[PDB]
Homo-oligomer: A and B are copies of this chain.
């Protein structure tokens, strides 16, 4: 709020990075053009529109496949140092496999986007996989549910090789996966993401899975896939100045009460949310708490794998939005986990014991502003996990805009709530950096308003407004205007 409280670029180091981010399926559109194979999401939205809040799909998105030159202009205008976007697996390998052949148009597109960004002095941060699994592999062996722990791993590794092959010379920053926890938990736990599987009795499109097992199977394959891709990268592609890693979605955790019991609950919560995928790439295995609680439901790694996994990164991405109070749940005959996330034996509350929310509500159903949680998370990365190079690869909020409660374009552009939120977190990074945090960059999540998975188009997360009523025309929002001023000045 206060003038001296508003972040200034000179607050951060000269080499610090500021940018924006998106994901292929959310913005690309052209779902079936120039030889692009079908994805799990194409398949899910088309077959189960009832599972999308407004029954929409992303056949078009923000049409960034055809309008990338504009996205680049926008980034240049705001003075962003970098841009993080993902690559569509099927647009590159329609069948998802080597034998399926590499789609030249798919390669050409990302090739053009990369050169243009660079031409304009914007560093590309390439996310190899953002939930878009080729349907071919999905039907072939369930994709990441691959009970063999081999097929999907090799297929993902080849996909990566093609990316390193065709873009390696230009790309200096790679991210193998983005939000693996939300992907596995939502796609196989609660079943709100494609393909929509969950345990019998649960309300999802295909209640014939197992919410206590599939998320861990998928998670295991993701980790094996990551380790293999990084091995390949370090052996045949890494250069003295390039980096590879992955990004984790994470909610800050705060003890519900003062009991040491809730502090324990909090620990188990960080473990099942962040630790799940971070500990394996850090030391080669899952958090002890998860193994003691999920037991046989959580696969074991071979010695070779643990070896390939430990230290498989040069930098790590953190996608932060909110936090929750963690309240203890005792083990006893009166309680039985139903969802994989229930293995943490802790309830995640928005309201503390005083009935008040952990932070001011930002609009949609789950984002409560609590920049303190980001600070705690960075302190944990610094003191417990080796203080590696950190990039806040995602941060932002979603403005609600439904057919029942339309959000006027004027109001959509005057996103002061978003601006305030963004400046608070950027300020939080300043503090963490002075305390020793190895944070090296910040990416505002959603360069553009786009498809928001099961929420469809009911939420606008962009710093740039997209008018789909008029050829997806881009309009800077106040938040984008400030970022432009911030990056300049």
Chain A residues packing against B (C-beta within 8 Å): 260-261, 264, 283, 285, 288-289, 291-293, 300, 328, 330-333, 345, 384
The 6 tightest CB contacts between A and B, nearest first, are A291-B331, A292-B292, A260-B384, A292-B293, A264-B288, A292-B331
Residues of B within 8 A of A384 (CB): 260
**In the assembly, what is the distance between CA of A346 and CA of B331, in Å?**
22
**In the assembly, what is the distance between CA of A384 and CA of B259, in Å?**
8
Contact present for B261 and A283 (CB under 8 Å): yes
Q: Which residue of B lies closest to A283 (CB)?
A: B261
Known A261-B288, A285-B330, A288-B331; further 10 A-B contacts with Cβ < 8 A = A260-B384, A288-B328, A288-B330, A291-B330, A291-B332, A292-B292, A292-B293, A292-B345, A300-B332, A300-B333
Residues of B within 8 A of A328 (CB): 288
In the complex, which of the residues A260, A285, A345 has the most CB atoms of chain B within 10 Å of its own CB atom? Answer: A260
| Min C-beta distance of A355 to chain B, whole Å | 24
**In the assembly, what is the distance between CA of A328 and CA of B283, in Å?**
13
| Min C-beta distance of A257 to chain B, whole Å | 13
**In the assembly, what is the distance between CA of A384 and CA of B332, in Å?**
23
Residues of B within 8 A of A260 (CB): 384
Q: Which residue of B lies closest to A296 (CB)?
A: B333
Residues of B within 8 A of A292 (CB): 289, 292-293, 331, 345
Q: Which residue of B lies closest to A268 (CB)?
A: B288
Residues of B within 8 A of A261 (CB): 283, 288
Q: Which residue of B lies closest to A265 (CB)?
A: B288
**In the assembly, what is the distance between CA of A264 and CA of B384, in Å?**
12
**In the assembly, what is the distance between CA of A260 and CA of B381, in Å?**
12
| Min C-beta distance of A260 to chain B, whole Å | 5
| Min C-beta distance of A343 to chain B, whole Å | 10
Residues of B within 8 A of A330 (CB): 285, 288, 291
**In the assembly, what is the distance between CA of A300 and CA of B333, in Å?**
8
| Min C-beta distance of A330 to chain B, whole Å | 6
Residues of B within 8 A of A333 (CB): 300
**In the assembly, what is the distance between CA of A330 and CA of B264, in Å?**
19
**In the assembly, what is the distance between CA of A237 and CA of B400, in Å?**
65
| Min C-beta distance of A289 to chain B, whole Å | 8
Q: Which residue of B lies closest to A345 (CB)?
A: B288
Residues of B within 8 A of A289 (CB): 292
| Min C-beta distance of A162 to chain B, whole Å | 35
Residues of B within 8 A of A288 (CB): 261, 264, 328, 330-331, 345
Residues of B within 8 A of A264 (CB): 288
Residues of B within 8 A of A291 (CB): 330-332
Q: Which residue of B lies closest to A285 (CB)?
A: B330
**In the assembly, what is the distance between CA of A134 and CA of B340, in Å?**
49
| Min C-beta distance of A333 to chain B, whole Å | 6
**In the assembly, what is the distance between CA of A175 and CA of B291, in Å?**
39
| Min C-beta distance of A310 to chain B, whole Å | 12
**In the assembly, what is the distance between CA of A332 and CA of B305, in Å?**
14
In the complex, which of the residues A300, A331, A345, A384 has the most CB atoms of chain B within 10 Å of its own CB atom? Answer: A331
Could you list 11 examples of A-B contacts with CB < 8 Å?
A260-B384, A261-B283, A264-B288, A288-B330, A288-B345, A289-B292, A291-B330, A291-B332, A292-B293, A292-B331, A300-B332
In the complex, which of the residues A285, A292, A332, A345 has the most CB atoms of chain B within 10 Å of its own CB atom? Answer: A292
| Min C-beta distance of A285 to chain B, whole Å | 6
In the complex, which of the residues A288, A300, A330, A384 has the most CB atoms of chain B within 10 Å of its own CB atom? Answer: A288
